[PDB]
């Protein structure tokens, strides 16, 4: 008897209201849903997780003085090309990037996890354009 391997199944769509939630703790759960480690038939070499839609990304909450102290960083490859952007500003300019950057770092490196991050659709503000997919609201 060799271990069961699932043939491709229809992917489930999920909706999460990120409002008032703690950044890092919501991140892990979404990563989990993305991996598909909540499914008894989990297999590490195929994309079989959930599609995860997140709303109210801008209304994510964070403890301590991180709003002023968390510095997101980008290096351009040029001399003196290290850009430092604090959390306050990142929410003020591209708020959906906050949940995105967090969730991304908690996904596996390489081709697969890179494509798993594509199954994450994050929006700031209560509305998402995926009513066609009819997402199942999740409490997390």
């Amino acid at each position: 008897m060799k271990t069961y391997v699932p043939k491709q199944v229809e992917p489930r769509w999920v909706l999460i209201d990120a409002e008032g939630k703690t950044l890092g703790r919501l991140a892990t759960k979404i990563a989990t849903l993305l991996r598909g480690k909540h499914r008894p038939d989990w297999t590490p070499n195929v994309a079989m997780g959930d599609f995860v839609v997140v709303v109210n990304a801008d209304k994510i909450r964070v403890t301590g003085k991180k709003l002023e102290q968390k510095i997101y960083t980008r290096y351009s490859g040029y001399p003196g090309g290290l850009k430092k952007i604090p959390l306050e500003k990142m929410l003020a300019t591209h708020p959906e990037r906050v949940l995105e950057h967090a969730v991304k770092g908690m996904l596996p490196k390489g081709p697969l996890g890179r494509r798993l991050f594509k199954r994450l659709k994050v929006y700031a503000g209560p509305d998402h354009p995926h009513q066609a997919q009819r997402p199942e609201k999740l409490e997390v």
Binding site: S76, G77, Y78, P79
Partner: protein
Amino acid sequence: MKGILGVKVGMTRIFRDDRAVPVTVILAGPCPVVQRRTPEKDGYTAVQLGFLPQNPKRVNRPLKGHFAKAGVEPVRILREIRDFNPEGDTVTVEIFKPGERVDVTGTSKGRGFAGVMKRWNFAGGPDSHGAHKIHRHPGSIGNRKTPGRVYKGKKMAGHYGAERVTVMNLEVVDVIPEENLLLVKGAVPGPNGGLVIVRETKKA
């Protein structure tokens, strides 16, 4: 924020108040608006301008359809002026009065594969005292094992010119509506016969 397409015609100087004024002459008008970009339809605000009469024999069917939706005769060049919304269906040199101050965008003359001394004003090497085949050379391009590489953007030889250049805060010295002329004080990018764009200046 007004604007107009045009062609650089050439330079002279004129006399104003016992003073010689170097000028570049630009044939600007007339420019028919062939499309308007709207925040509802296009997400921003601009006016697509046309310029120079075109032989309709040369205008393909995709393009012909476009010109018809605007009820405008075929034109050689299309360019947009952003955050401009003229009342009329046509833009002429009239939108500038002498004394005003403008920005001119053009295509700089191309110096092709240019050395480092012309491109980047390097000082090169000596011409005697032992200098060995390095008279127009850059010299060092780095350090040693640390960092063991070359910076991005490191000034080196390569193509130079034939690139977009915008000169700012140029005085309008005169405007001659009967000939669609614009007289601007000083130097404008590109060769005579080259296409330019004239916008109201963003300086104070």
